[PDB]
Amino acid sequence: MILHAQAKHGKPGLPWLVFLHGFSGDCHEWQEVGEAFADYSRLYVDLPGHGGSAAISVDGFDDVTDLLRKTLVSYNILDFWLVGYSLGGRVAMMAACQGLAGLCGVIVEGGHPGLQNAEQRAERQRSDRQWVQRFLTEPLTAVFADWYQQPVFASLNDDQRRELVALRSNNNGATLAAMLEATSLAVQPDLRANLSARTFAFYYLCGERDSKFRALAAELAADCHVIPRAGHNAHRENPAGVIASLAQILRF
């Protein structure tokens, strides 16, 4: 079993850019940005429970990393960057720290490096449990209308929220629920120490208006690129700014 993905081949010999979307996203998430790097090869991955990988279930990050590994081998990818947004950024950090052969760098946009005590983990476990029940029982247009009013999305305007609700409502609530639980921040290790001691290059992207993750990026031992006039999903809101930041990272 491998993950569903869309591959675009660039110049032979150049690295792959392997893109990981966030929760409720799919492999289209990073394509507006990624296709600007037409010289590189691009792999747009559907995470378990998402897109064409809906039917792939996982118990946790170990399974996701294994599936990522197998997917890379299947596409003959030997030299690559992992680029992840939000949940995809957490998947990228977990996989990179567990070890992925051929990984040369990780770029994370708004990915949480991990909670730091039991009370925080309990709060997140309980809140994700509540979201799981909603994804199993409610119209997705209703669930996503609330999803995009969470604090991390406070910066959005109502036109942006309406568009996102319509987009994310194309999803399987049951398989989203399963993945939400399986890779919940509540079960993720605190990766700060591991990230500090990294073999691989590590870069962080954060929207200017994303107060929570601007603070977190500062805690990390990483070059952080703040994307102007953008919230948490900075590549969606300011794709040209993110393309510029990626170009600075990759080509130097």
Residue ranges in contact with ligand 164 by CB under 6 A: 22-24, 86-87, 90, 112, 152, 185, 233
Q: How far is the CB of 11 from ligand 164 (least distance, A)?
A: 31
25 versus 241: smaller Cβ distance to ligand 164: 25
Structure tokens at 205: 């992207």
Q: How far is the CB of 252 from ligand 164 (least distance, A)?
A: 28
Residue 128: partners with Cβ closer than 8 Å, 6 or more residues away:
180, 181, 184, 185, 186
40 versus 135: smaller Cβ distance to ligand 164: 135
CA 5 vs CA 18, 21, 166, 216: distances in Å:
10, 11, 22, 30
Contact (CB, 8 A) for 85 and 21: yes
22 versus 48: smaller Cβ distance to ligand 164: 22
Q: Where are the alpha helices (DSSP H) in 15-75?
A: 31-34, 61-74
5 versus 143: smaller Cβ distance to ligand 164: 143
Q: How far is the CB of 250 from ligand 164 (least distance, A)?
A: 23
Q: How far is the CB of 86 from ligand 164 (least distance, A)?
A: 3
Instruction: Give the integer Cα–Cα distance in Å for 142 and 146.
Output: 7
Q: How far is the CB of 156 from ligand 164 (least distance, A)?
A: 10
Q: Using DSSP bridges, classify how beta strands 80-85 and 16-20 pair: parallel, antiparallel or unpaired.
A: parallel
15 versus 25: smaller Cβ distance to ligand 164: 25
Structure tokens at 209: 């208006």
